[PDB]
Amino acid sequence: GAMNSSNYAELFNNDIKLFVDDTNVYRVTVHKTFEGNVATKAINGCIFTLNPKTGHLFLKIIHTSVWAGQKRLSQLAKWKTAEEVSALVRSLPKEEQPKQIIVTRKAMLDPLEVHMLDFPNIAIRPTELRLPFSAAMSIDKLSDVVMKATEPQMVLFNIYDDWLDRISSYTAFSRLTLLLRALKTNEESAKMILLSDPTITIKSYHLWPSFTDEQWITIESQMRDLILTEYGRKYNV
């Protein structure tokens, strides 16, 4: 059924699974019209489809042209997400297709379930975790590829860089979610922390800086402080 803190290690077993997060599929700026009314302008978005074991991220870019002349866009966005996830599964070889797909938001369940009817053995699941995948657009290189897109496009990343060479997938996923939680609660401070030392660079083929093991501990520590800090600055504690 639903995925939560009790069955958290199942993410890192050998049954292929994907997380799907649709938060950033339909993105708008809200503005005033000459007549003093409000209007939205859509900007490019993405589906965040992530294998939590391997780090493989299938970033389907959603070009604003997909909304042209469509109504009830927030509702369409969920079905478009489902259409694209289903098209992704069908494009994968059978032995790479997921056994489960976990949606981060419950409103995706019925749209994905209907689009995956042809895949009765793929279990579509919600989660009670509050995962920070909405902050994926705070990762500069992912934001850059979405905004520059001039057509629908799928880009493949490994969101863990080379981390799996040194750490387990459980640890890699805990780092990832800590970074993204920080970027979601205070993006500026989070990005300040990640780059404050000019000597640590981001490899052209990576997303995040090339920290040593020790430097990663210091980083992770500073990100938890930030999250606790903001939790105070928010609630005054």
Partner: protein, 300 residues
């Protein structure tokens, strides 16, 4: 006017006939029910005084044969049977009528309730879901499960209602996922009406039958089938105008007839609130909405 003769009444039982019911005491001199309106199906049902568990009964149509009730002390129930010897039967009935041992089906002349609840309910069709072909009448009880229930265990004793499932390949055209899931007109009009039921009368008949089994036997899977069939129409943007007018009448009389104290179980809050207030046909069920608001405003 036709007659259903009871060999005897050896156990205390509440007897239903259509929407009417009467108590019979252990070994009371009861020998059946007379003056049954020809032209309609009928149901005659039973609830033993000792074990209110298992309401059971028999759908029948007096035009199709001479039918009688006799208690079976081995299986412990009142069984319907057919008498093929017409004169043996006329003579049995005439004697019990002369001795005034029968209750009269008590139809008020003004009263169209039973007609209105069974308008699309034929009896040869009833037997296509309650499969027992050696009999002209059909047994139903509280605990029989439907074909669809068994998919999610004895097949001979099942209710073979039409399977409706909104998240099935049958209901959803490839490439029309969103369209077909949010407006079910394709599934209603093409798959079910044109494909399976053939016409609105076969749709209405199954639906009316589902309701009556839910009300009379507390058959849960019937209740599920009745809600599903309502939800498929209400969730279709394109329904023939005659079907909506007729549906409004059908549901009106079903809601009118439901015992006031059984609404809590027999009525699905989500389905009704969706059908009356959110669905495409939210404005097309005036009579049904008005009786539901005046009779069961709590559900809503």
């Amino acid at each position: 006017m036709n007659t259903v003769p009871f060999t005897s009444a050896p156990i205390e039982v509440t007897i239903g006939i259509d929407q009417y019911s009467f108590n019979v005491k252990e070994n009371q001199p009861f020998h059946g029910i007379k003056d049954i309106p020809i032209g309609h199906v009928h149901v005659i049902h039973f609830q033993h005084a000792d074990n209110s568990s298992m309401r059971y009964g028999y759908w029948f149509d007096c035009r199709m044969g001479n039918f009688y009730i006799q208690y079976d002390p081995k299986d412990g129930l009142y069984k319907m049977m057919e008498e093929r010897d017409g004169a043996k039967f006329e003579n049995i009935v005439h004697n019990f009528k002369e001795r005034q041992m029968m209750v009269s089906y008590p139809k008020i002349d003004e009263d169209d309730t039973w007609y209105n609840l069974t308008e699309f309910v034929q009896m040869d069709k009833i037997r296509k879901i309650v499969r027992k072909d050696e009999n002209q009448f059909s047994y139903v009880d509280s605990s029989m499960t439907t074909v669809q229930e068994n998919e999610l265990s004895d097949p001979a004793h099942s209710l073979n209602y039409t399977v409706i499932n909104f998240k099935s390949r049958e209901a959803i055209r490839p490439g029309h996922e969103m369209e077909d899931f949010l407006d079910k007109s394709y599934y209603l009009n093409t798959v079910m009406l044109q494909g399976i039921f053939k016409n609105s009368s076969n749709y209405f008949g199954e639906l009316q039958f589902a309701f009556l089994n839910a009300m009379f036997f507390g058959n849960y899977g019937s209740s599920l089938q009745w809600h599903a069939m309502i939800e498929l129409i209400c969730s279709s943007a394109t329904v023939p105008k005659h079907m909506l007018d007729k549906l409004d009448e059908i549901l009106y009389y079903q809601i009118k007839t439901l015992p006031e104290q059984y609404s809590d179980i027999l009525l699905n809050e989500r389905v009704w609130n969706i059908c009356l207030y959110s669905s495409f046909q939210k404005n097309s069920l005036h009579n049904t909405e008005k009786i539901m608001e005046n009779k069961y405003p709590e559900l809503l």
